[PDB]
């Protein structure tokens, strides 16, 4: 049985990739030295593949993004960049003020760079897949170039600001594109390349028959090449149509869904091609029963096997993770150990009761009114307004404030244990007190504690929740040179003790103005983490939801009038197929309402970072919040159209009027344009004024003046609509 593997992490066991990248950018090392560091990573990867699988991928060490590489390869370099000079122009397209837009790669935590097609004509600008081939060739190693298929490349790109996803939009462009590919392939085939790994994950989106008619012709023109196509993240939209493509080797993801299998054993698989069962999950870190897996591969008479989806979604290795909770490590498996499981499967082909809180589990299993707030919005509204006494067009912020390097250095010392709880506790309060006075002096109406004690919105909570563990070196690539260690939800989730009361209560005792409670939603917490697969995702979300609700009662009991639940993954966690959204939102909505099941007089705020709400608004309407903050600066308020077009919308809206990803200071005229836009249809008493999002990434010198304008804006605004 032929064993395949792809997506093995490119970062290195010590994140040497990130270091080489940052050393080159800062000027600490030359391109030659950079390349040397790179070539070493290449050997590190091929070495791991060789020891476990039969097919060793090639062209996988992207210096920033593989979609970007695909774009450079076909000549898609925006005119603003001039002539492609090399890494220099390559990094200009990846980072900095002229860079391509970045965004999430399908439903994962990896971000790619969006190509911008400015001409209908593509051409072979650079054959990176051949370069890399001859490279592992010189070193005496045979590799199968790893490329992103032509259909997917276009589907992940834009033209004149719009995704290129309708069949009429792609048709013309594709013809000119496959020309570059065929050209690339022939060259590979000439130099002896015996196999090419083509990636078409876009085959799993909700495609029209017309898409397939188009895809079919794409692959007819490339039929003379030794292509092996892979699909993952969900089931392919048209099974029968997919198994008809002019390809001899076809990969399927049998882990992330039940449709591929069901389809394959209801309509069968063609005898003119070979199946490569993707049976090892590349998105979860759990050790699996290679038994029941061998049974699958056997019953399906699959000729090959491989991981379901890329392995770059997992950490490099579990080897040194020896500080994990009791028994956890024994059940884990990261990238390298996934490669080892494949080998064990090949060779053979030739733990549920863990961490459980039955009272918690049962608690979840058992009233209905725990998902519904005792009163309807219109009633809660009256009370809250009376309690709050806020002015018309009340101003507030999203939560975090810039971080002094001292703030950063100190929070790390507490983790490392260098200082004591008391000493860190004292430091944070001085940071909070300083923040509260500044905000009061600026003129804000509703204040926040600054989140100086939090590394990030998910990690902070993972370390305080039972059933969730964090790793030491489990670093995963997000984009460019930035990595993140995703927590691991290994058991039933419960909160042992209050997690935020000390800072929130303290912050509030220093002011007569309302100080927001600051929580992260249940979906977002699991969206950024790995979690158990042996239980419905809905259950894990409910467990975390209960944990957060318990925290909400504490804040209320303590006298906090406003509580904010950040739920930016509400939409991001959503299935890739919009057709599978119904089921998903059902439990995602319940999880949020369960977490925000507060008393009538507690004003709940929901914060979301989405650039557009037209496709989920019917789902948002169902969340029992009292106000929802949104990022309206980029659209200059136009993002409000989904709200003003929603019949019967009556909830408050935190209009983001400032783009916190740019260090610039939004002028008053600037912020007004947006507010004015939002006041076109919606009642003035529904509007709040705030920044697009949190300020943890900005600097105080840019924040103070921007905040002053924002307060100055609301002042003027109140004078008008007096
Ligand atoms: N409370 C967080 C929200 C991030 S979406 C912040 O203000 O940074
Ligand atoms: O249908 C999937 C699309 O919306 C993007 O997530 C692909 O990256
Ligand atoms: Zn945000």
Author numbering: 1 to 350, 361 to 376, 378 to 733
Question: Which text from the study accompanies this structure?
Answer:
Cobalamin-independent methionine synthase (MetE) catalyzes the transfer of a methyl group from methyltetrahydrofolate to L-homocysteine (Hcy) without using an intermediate methyl carrier. Crystallographic analyses of MetE from T. maritima reveal an unusual dual-barrel structure in which the active site lies between the tops of the two (βα)8 barrels. The fold of the N-terminal barrel confirms that it has evolved from the C-terminal polypeptide by gene duplication; comparisons of the barrels provide an intriguing example of homologous domain evolution in which binding sites are obliterated. The C-terminal barrel incorporates the zinc ion that binds and activates Hcy.
In the complex of Hcy with zinc-replete MetE, Hcy is positioned by numerous interactions with conserved protein residues. The amino group is coordinated by hydrogen bonds to Asp577, Glu462, and the carbonyl of Ile409. The carboxyl group of Hcy is bound by the backbone amide and the side chain hydroxyl of Ser411, and hydrophobic contact to the Hcy sulfur is provided by Met468. Hcy binding induces significant changes at the metal site. Binding of the substrate sulfur to zinc does not proceed by a simple dissociative reaction in which sulfur is substituted for the oxygen of Glu642. Instead, Hcy approaches the metal ion from the side opposite the Glu642 ligand. In the structure of the binary complex determined at pH 5.2, displacement of Glu642 and inversion at Zn+2 are incomplete. Zinc coordination changes from tetrahedral to distorted trigonal bipyramidal geometry, and the substrate sulfur and glutamate oxygen both exhibit unusually long ligand–metal distances: 3.15 Å and 2.9 Å for Zn–S and Zn–O, respectively. When Hcy binds, the side chain of Met468 alters its position in concert with backbone displacements of the aspartic acid and methionine residues that start the helix. Because the crystals of the Hcy binary complex of MetE were equilibrated at pH 5.2, it is possible that Hcy may be protonated in the X-ray structure.
